[PDB]
Amino acid sequence: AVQKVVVHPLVLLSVVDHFNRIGKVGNQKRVVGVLLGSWQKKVLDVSNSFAVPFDEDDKDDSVWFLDHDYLENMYGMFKKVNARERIVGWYHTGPKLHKNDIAINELMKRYCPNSVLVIIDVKPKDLGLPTEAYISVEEVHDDGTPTSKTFEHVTSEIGAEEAEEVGVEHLLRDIKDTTVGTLSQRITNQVHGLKGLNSKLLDIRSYLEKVATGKLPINHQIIYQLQDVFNLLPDVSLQEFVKAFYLKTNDQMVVVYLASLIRSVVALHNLINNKIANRDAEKKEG
Amino acid sequence: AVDTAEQVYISSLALLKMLKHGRAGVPMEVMGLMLGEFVDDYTVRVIDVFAMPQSGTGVSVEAVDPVFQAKMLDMLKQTGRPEMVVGWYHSHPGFGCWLSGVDINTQQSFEALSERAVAVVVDPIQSVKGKVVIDAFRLINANMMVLGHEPRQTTSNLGHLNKPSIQALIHGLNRHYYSITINYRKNELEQKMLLNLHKKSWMEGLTLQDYVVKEMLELAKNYNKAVEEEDKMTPEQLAIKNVGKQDPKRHLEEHVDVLMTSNIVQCLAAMLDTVVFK
Amino acid sequence: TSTRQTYFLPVIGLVDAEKLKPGDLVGVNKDSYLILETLPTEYDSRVKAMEVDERPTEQYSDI
Ligand SMILES: [Zn+2]
């Protein structure tokens, strides 16, 4: 079915520009619309969409309505201009999901066998690659609950297209690209420890909270399982590198050797040729 | 009577369907419609752009369905903003995006409907990322040849847009037409996330993910050694000697600075041992 | 295509493969390259019909 989704900045903006539409008139809830997907393969892609007036009451927390006269005839519009573009699901800006979201997908399953919902974010904050994606399946449960319909997270990734980077990538103009090979990889390293070890502390504090409160989630078992896959090397005191010690510097063996060999001859190219051309102009002029 | 140079405020949402709907018609030319509000004579804004059915038999003035707009405006009422129509646009991917013979026939028809009806063209081909490309024009009336034929006041917004002058046939259409200025009213809220969504997705996906060892340096040493002798024969070729050969010639680049950065790639990637671990 | 170019398109769409063995003369629209109907008959100009003769003014009794 649906494994991963591809969200373009163009269709994501179609949720963002509608945040100006109903944001000025208010009032409650969020921006919600129906998603037009482009499915060429198991990997899902999204090009365009259409935003529909939508509201969700608080009291009355289970009340939701799409406008389906907007959904029907406007489909024949986008279908007439683009035959490949069709509705794969819906979307909204979240930020989180209330329990009522179970009924939005099951209603529109007449349009698509499986409707994928995309939670987006109009204001970028944290922690990383934004928005979100969910898929609607039924896993029931191990405890014996009646059949449980819970949306499972779908990994979301941004993607590009020809001719769409004209105006999009133009307006920024302030970015330095990249530079690959010097700063590009090292800034990630400073962040790879930051973003790597912050979720380490956020989860290890919530995993300690388990014993305290919030149990379940037990989880189970996914938590410790892949944590023990992380445990191929801990790495703890001290590094257990006795076999990887001589191999540590042995990987730095040729990297330092070439860096010593290149800088020697690069100098011979830089130093000699500079002295030659310099004294040819300098002393022959005066 | 009084005519002042117009300034076009385009929304980042209206910029989407210009290139996107134009990409769907590639290679063939499409016909769209511009949506916006007329503030005054010297400024104009396009707040929305929508897609219209592409013509596989060629663009015509009847390609725009009036019941398509009448059903669209009604759907814009239940949508947040029901703004009145303004003008039209069309893609021209196959060439340098100039107004064709059909574009002038649909001018007097659209300029009768709406006052301005700015003619807007767009092309995918001229660039990819860092150029505005697109196009825009506005019909100056040929009946005005009796009157003064050189609008507009506040000139160089035209005059500067009259640069580069874009070859000949394009500005050959400057007879009976005059282009219009396109500036971006700030969407920067969306434009700030446009940079954040683009670069974060391009930074190692987590920034973590991405962060032929000696052999890649054995393949590099062929570029770091076997390339040296073909590079270091040139200073012996600079020795004539002396001097019958035409000079100067500079062979210093680009291999020297490439092997420099080649070590910059290999040194900081080897620092991943010291960086990631401890 | 008789222009000396050769193209690649899915099976028509409309008239199916029931007719016929590989032909010519069929109509197709501009660069869209879709064939609506398989059109007869053969070719060309005076090669198809050399001369059109109704009947002579004389009969076999004239000898
Ligand atoms: Zn045209």
UniProtKB/Swiss-Prot annotation, chain A:
<protein>
    <recommendedName>
        <fullName>26S proteasome non-ATPase regulatory subunit 7</fullName>
    </recommendedName>
</protein>
<dbReference type="GO" id="GO:0034774">
    <property type="term" value="C:secretory granule lumen"/>
</dbReference>
<dbReference type="InterPro" id="IPR033858">
    <property type="entry name" value="MPN_RPN7_8"/>
</dbReference>
<dbReference type="GO" id="GO:0005576">
    <property type="term" value="C:extracellular region"/>
</dbReference>
<feature type="domain" description="MPN">
    <location>
        <begin position="5"/>
        <end position="140"/>
    </location>
</feature>
<keyword id="KW-0647">Proteasome</keyword>
<feature type="modified residue" description="N6-acetyllysine">
    <location>
        <position position="200"/>
    </location>
</feature>
<dbReference type="GO" id="GO:0070062">
    <property type="term" value="C:extracellular exosome"/>
</dbReference>
<dbReference type="GO" id="GO:0005654">
    <property type="term" value="C:nucleoplasm"/>
</dbReference>
<comment type="function">
    <text>Component of the 26S proteasome, a multiprotein complex involved in the ATP-dependent degradation of ubiquitinated proteins. This complex plays a key role in the maintenance of protein homeostasis by removing misfolded or damaged proteins, which could impair cellular functions, and by removing proteins whose functions are no longer required. Therefore, the proteasome participates in numerous cellular processes, including cell cycle progression, apoptosis, or DNA damage repair.</text>
</comment>
<dbReference type="GO" id="GO:0005838">
    <property type="term" value="C:proteasome regulatory particle"/>
</dbReference>
<dbReference type="Pfam" id="PF01398">
    <property type="entry name" value="JAB"/>
</dbReference>
<dbReference type="GO" id="GO:0016020">
    <property type="term" value="C:membrane"/>
</dbReference>
<dbReference type="GO" id="GO:0043161">
    <property type="term" value="P:proteasome-mediated ubiquitin-dependent protein catabolic process"/>
</dbReference>
<feature type="modified residue" description="N6-acetyllysine">
    <location>
        <position position="210"/>
    </location>
</feature>
Curated annotation (Swiss-Prot), chain B:
<dbReference type="GO" id="GO:0140492">
    <property type="term" value="F:metal-dependent deubiquitinase activity"/>
</dbReference>
<comment type="subunit">
    <text>Component of the 19S proteasome regulatory particle complex. The 26S proteasome consists of a 20S core particle (CP) and two 19S regulatory subunits (RP). The regulatory particle is made of a lid composed of 9 subunits including PSMD4, a base containing 6 ATPases and few additional components. Within the complex, PSMD4 interacts with subunit PSMD7 through their respective MPN domain. Interacts with TXNL1.</text>
</comment>
<feature type="binding site">
    <location>
        <position position="90"/>
    </location>
    <ligand>
        <name>Zn(2+)</name>
    </ligand>
</feature>
<keyword id="KW-0227">DNA damage</keyword>
<dbReference type="GO" id="GO:0005634">
    <property type="term" value="C:nucleus"/>
</dbReference>
<dbReference type="GO" id="GO:0031597">
    <property type="term" value="C:cytosolic proteasome complex"/>
</dbReference>
<keyword id="KW-0647">Proteasome</keyword>
<feature type="modified residue" description="Phosphoserine">
    <location>
        <position position="201"/>
    </location>
</feature>
<dbReference type="InterPro" id="IPR056263">
    <property type="entry name" value="RPN11_C"/>
</dbReference>
<dbReference type="GO" id="GO:0006303">
    <property type="term" value="P:double-strand break repair via nonhomologous end joining"/>
</dbReference>
<dbReference type="InterPro" id="IPR037518">
    <property type="entry name" value="MPN"/>
</dbReference>
<dbReference type="GO" id="GO:0043161">
    <property type="term" value="P:proteasome-mediated ubiquitin-dependent protein catabolic process"/>
</dbReference>
<feature type="domain" description="MPN">
    <location>
        <begin position="8"/>
        <end position="143"/>
    </location>
</feature>
<dbReference type="GO" id="GO:0045471">
    <property type="term" value="P:response to ethanol"/>
</dbReference>
<dbReference type="InterPro" id="IPR050242">
    <property type="entry name" value="JAMM_MPN+_peptidase_M67A"/>
</dbReference>
UniProtKB/Swiss-Prot annotation, chain C:
<protein>
    <recommendedName>
        <fullName>26S proteasome regulatory subunit 6A</fullName>
    </recommendedName>
</protein>
<comment type="subunit">
    <text>Component of the 19S proteasome regulatory particle complex. The 26S proteasome consists of a 20S core particle (CP) and two 19S regulatory subunits (RP). The regulatory particle is made of a lid composed of 9 subunits, a base containing 6 ATPases including PSMC3 and few additional components. Interacts with PAAF1.</text>
</comment>
<comment type="similarity">
    <text>Belongs to the AAA ATPase family.</text>
</comment>
<comment type="subunit">
    <text>(Microbial infection) Interacts with HIV-1 Tat.</text>
</comment>
<comment type="function">
    <text>Component of the 26S proteasome, a multiprotein complex involved in the ATP-dependent degradation of ubiquitinated proteins. This complex plays a key role in the maintenance of protein homeostasis by removing misfolded or damaged proteins, which could impair cellular functions, and by removing proteins whose functions are no longer required. Therefore, the proteasome participates in numerous cellular processes, including cell cycle progression, apoptosis, or DNA damage repair.</text>
</comment>
